[PDB]
Amino acid sequence: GEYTEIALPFSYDGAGEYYWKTDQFSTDPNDWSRYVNSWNLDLLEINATDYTNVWVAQHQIPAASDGYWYIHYKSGVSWGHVEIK
């Protein structure tokens, strides 16, 4: 289906609506280097929690029960940005 595998570190800059997935987030509670960040987005949802335009450490986002992180990005504008280390 339409969630496609991305490789980390990952970024995307631009407009559009996409469904990405990965099982490669950090799960280490003592790591602070591996973040999700975004700006100027309409949406960044990861496993049904809202992380739109926030910086968050990856170990703070638990994986779904299949071990994956499912990410839904939406931007109407070219200056939209996401980074997933």
**Strand ordering across the sheet containing 4-5:** 4-5, 16-22, 69-75, 43-46, 49-50
Q: How was this structure determined?
A: X-ray
Specify whether the backbone of 53 is left (phi greater than 0), alpha (psi in -120 to 50) or beta.
Answer: left
Q: In 3-state terms, what secondary structure has residue 38? A: strand
Q: Give the rounded distance of the alpha carbon of 39 from its chain centre.
A: 12
HSE-CB of 70 using CA atoms within 13 angstroms: 10
How far is the C-alpha of 37 from the C-alpha of 51, rounded, in Å?
Answer: 8
CA distances from 45 to 30, 34, 48 (A): 23, 17, 6
Give strand pairing partners of 71. 20, 46
Give strand pairing partners of 60. none
